[PDB]
Structure 1
Amino acid sequence: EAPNQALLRILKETEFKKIKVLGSGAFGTVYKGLWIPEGEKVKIPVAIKELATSPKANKEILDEAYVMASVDNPHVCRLLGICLTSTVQLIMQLMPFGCLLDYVREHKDNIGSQYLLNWCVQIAKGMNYLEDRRLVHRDLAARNVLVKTPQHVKITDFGRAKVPIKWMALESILHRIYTHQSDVWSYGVTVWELMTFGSKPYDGIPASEISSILEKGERLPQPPICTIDVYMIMVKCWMIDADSRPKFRELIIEFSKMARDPQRYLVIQGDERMHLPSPTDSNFDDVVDADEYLI
């Protein structure tokens, strides 16, 4: 097929500075930082990820860099570049509000119907892009949806393009079959995650029983704030026959219809006087966002 003409940008360690650690997980450490290119008079808010030097880990970090550099979409996280220090560093756009799963858990008292429905559109948009690119996520979940601004989200961790059964489609669990329609099931569970303001799917139930639960015909419950209109969509995403499930171009349209009259589709107590942080009095010297900086 088509040659991948993506540019892999190599950056100097001296061109960027680490401000504070954001997360020190099992894989490595993620820092909040600024990238100050050459004599460009710009400061770009970045997230810098680094890793000991085991040849296996360096291989996985560079396969992740390969995919991340091969994508360009407003609702997909892009890699800015890589720095080849003693330990490889991935430089990417800063997503100040963290992942969507934490955001919905931490801001439930202020998340209105518009935001929830807009996020659903934004996620389907990113996913439909990944589909056009013939790229299957394999790990779509609310934890893998990063937040640029409360009104702009982007898909991440498609460095899978240890198994999360409770987000997996039936063909994925039994036959290890991963398609764009299997990602539609994961999208369904993600929508359920948002609609329940960060609830854990099939909580208490072990991972083994999931396969039988699904095969019997049992699905995730209807979130109280969901009308049968939104729930029917989630239910359609969880069908045995993958061809019967919605396509992401259909999900964009469906949620877009709903986003035009959000209170007809989501019933949130006190949604009208909610409002989340937006460009008003703050939200934000020569600092420019990565989405506005192109060489």
Structure 2
Amino acid sequence: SMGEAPNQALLRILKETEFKKIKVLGSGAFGTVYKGLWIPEGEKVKIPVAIKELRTSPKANKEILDEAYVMASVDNPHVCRLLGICLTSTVQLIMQLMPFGCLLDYVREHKDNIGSQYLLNWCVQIAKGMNYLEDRRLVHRDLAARNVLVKTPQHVKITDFGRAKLLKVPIKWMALESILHRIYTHQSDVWSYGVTVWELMTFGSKPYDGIPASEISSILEKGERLPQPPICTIDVYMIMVKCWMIDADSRPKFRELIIEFSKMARDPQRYLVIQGDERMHLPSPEEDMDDVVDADEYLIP
């Protein structure tokens, strides 16, 4: 070809009869998400799934199918992949179940059991997910802690490709040039990565809390950034500050962020100071659960 390489991803279409809905997991601007089980007809397999549904019209269907295109196209351990779609009256996106929910809600609810090792490992895993999207020439355009999900406390993945593109908006996560000039690059995703880290290191504090969205661009033009979280050493805070430069190229690349956070993750208590960091433990690995298989172990030929 002359331009981008051909996208040879498989869009799998699933029957309504192949999966059960168990309960509702959430409802908001993103849509409505149900817990379910996907049982492929001719296989001794049960797959825990999230089933997304909109909150029916041509506008809704076009926009949700664009998201399905992008999700079906990605394949990385730190990115949520689409398992398939279902063509009932309402188009349903069938995704891998992330049992522990989004990372923002997780850090809020488990603040008193989250250690430096978990926080820094999460930063590494998000950076890998984003670096992969950069390899696929994809700008996420909505990276935040709410859009990172938790498969296990050890394993997180990036989600929500409803604004993802090739190379009411979230003003407080966006780079300055995105707010002013609608310019979006992988480096604008780095700014958002910085804000995402700040969310985690503050245990899910709202950025610029009280300051309205219209004040943000002039605040950033003057040079005011998000403050240093109590637990953050200058080493970690410097990296956030580097993500928030005016010059987009002067910000770090995701590959460098993988490197720096993985160096720090080898000696976590040198880079994050948390009271009682040693004694903390988070969980580690009704229904007939015998033939249950996680989607990550269910690979299509």
Q: What range describes the TM-score normalised by the shorter chain of this pair?
A: over 0.9
| 8 Å contact kept, 1:11–1:82 | yes
- Give yes or no for the alignment of 1:197 onto 2:191: no
TM normalised by structure 1 equals 0.97
- State the 1:284 CA deviation: 8.8
Q: What's the % identity of the aligned pairs?
A: 98
Residues 143, 26 of structure 1: CA spacing in aligned structure 2 closer, same or farther, 3 A cutoff? closer
| 8 Å contact kept, 2:27–2:55 | no
- State the 1:235 CA deviation: 0.5
SS at match of 2:132: helix
1:291 counterpart residue number? 296
| 8 Å contact kept, 2:72–2:83 | yes
| 8 Å contact kept, 1:193–1:200 | yes
Summarize the alignment of residues 257-268 of structure 1 with structure 2, pairs less than 5 Å apart: 257-268=263-274
Aligned pair partner of 1:249 in 255, 260, 282: 255
Residues 40, 5 of structure 1: CA spacing in aligned structure 2 closer, same or farther, 3 A cutoff? same
| 8 Å contact kept, 2:48–2:97 | yes
Residues 226, 26 of structure 1: CA spacing in aligned structure 2 closer, same or farther, 3 A cutoff? closer
- How far apart, CA to CA, are the structure 2 residues paired with 1:134 and 1:175? 21
| 8 Å contact kept, 1:52–1:87 | no
- How far apart, CA to CA, are the structure 2 residues paired with 1:35 and 1:284? 13
- How far apart, CA to CA, are the structure 2 residues paired with 1:112 and 1:282? 33
| 8 Å contact kept, 2:28–2:55 | no
- State the 1:158 CA deviation: 2.1
Cα distance per residue 1:46-104 (max 9 Å; x no partner): 00112382111111111111000010000011000001011111000000000000000
- State the 1:137 CA deviation: 0.6
SS at match of 1:243: coil
- State the 1:236 CA deviation: 0.5
| 8 Å contact kept, 1:277–1:283 | no
Structure 1 moving runs of 4+ over 3 Å = 281-284
| 8 Å contact kept, 1:42–1:288 | yes
- How far apart, CA to CA, are the structure 2 residues paired with 1:203 and 1:283? 46
The alignment yields a C-alpha RMSD, in angstroms, of 1.9
- State the 1:27 CA deviation: 5.6
Aligned pairs, number: 294
List runs of 5+ in structure 1 lacking aligned partners.
none
| 8 Å contact kept, 1:165–1:173 | yes
| 8 Å contact kept, 2:175–2:191 | yes
- How far apart, CA to CA, are the structure 2 residues paired with 1:207 and 1:272? 39
2:51 counterpart residue number? 48
| 8 Å contact kept, 1:65–1:79 | yes
